């Protein structure tokens, strides 16, 4: 239930949630093939009093290094009005996910003169060069670039 706490009854994440790598965005089930349990596996379940289940977790999770705040979901079925999809598809679900992106070490900066570089370090304001009236500079661009 932990792994499901953010899904509506249909299997869609709730608009306005926080999703991170591993998280299911949409539960989906699919039927098992001619590998319906082999001996090794039928027996292992024979021990656990839970007999072979016939559907599978094919859900749509989030890929490594992505994630954000579910902003929206579109659900297109067929059997509903307006809609008809490529042959053999019952329903398609799209879920748009937002991220606020602060600047970070690795991002690339540039100015209109061809000066470009990758943020390599973020000092705390106390280390920044500053002028006598106490104000600290924002950016330190090395002169060897010019």
């Amino acid at each position: 239930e932990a792994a499901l706490r953010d899904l509506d009854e249909e299997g869609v994440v709730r608009i306005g949630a926080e999703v991170k790598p591993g998280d299911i965005l949409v539960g989906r089930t699919s039927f098992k093939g001619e590998s319906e349990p082999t001996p090794e596996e039928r027996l292992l379940r024979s021990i656990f009093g839970e007999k072979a289940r016939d559907v599978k977790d094919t859900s749509l999770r989030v890929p490594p290094g992505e994630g954000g705040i579910v902003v929206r979901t579109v659900r297109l079925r067929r059997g509903d009005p307006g809609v008809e999809l490529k042959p053999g598809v019952r329903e398609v679900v799209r879920v748009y996910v937002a991220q606020k992106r602060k600047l970070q070490v690795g991002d690339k900066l540039a100015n209109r003169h061809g000066n470009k570089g990758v943020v390599a370090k973020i000092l705390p304001v106390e280390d920044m060069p500053h002028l006598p009236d106490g104000t600290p500079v924002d950016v330190i661009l090395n002169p060897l670039g010019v």
Partner: protein, 97 residues
């Protein structure tokens, strides 16, 4: 600066050590008031700068100013990737790309 010399603060001791140096460089005219000379550096785009790790000045006058600088579409978030093992290719059995 004028804002300063009226708020109860004159020139600063590290601004003179810098000016000593700026003069050897040749940025400022020898024998001229601190304000006269800071003026001369300012006109050059240059100002006195203190390393915040020490309070000591930068041995020189620096170019500080206001610059238009954009964030490009190329962010580490879109580009950090690594794999122990994963999908493979039908005929070659070598990992996808």
């Amino acid at each position: 600066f004028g804002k300063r010399k009226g708020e109860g603060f004159g020139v600063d001791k590290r601004e003179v050590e810098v000016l000593r140096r700026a003069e050897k460089l040749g940025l400022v005219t020898p024998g001229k008031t601190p304000e006269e000379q800071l003026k001369e550096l300012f006109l050059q785009g240059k100002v006195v700068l203190y390393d915040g790790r020490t309070g000591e000045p930068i041995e020189g006058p620096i170019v500080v100013g206001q610059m238009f600088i954009m964030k490009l579409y190329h962010m580490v978030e879109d580009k950090m990737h690594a794999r122990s093992t994963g999908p493979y290719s039908l005929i070659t059995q070598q990992p996808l790309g």
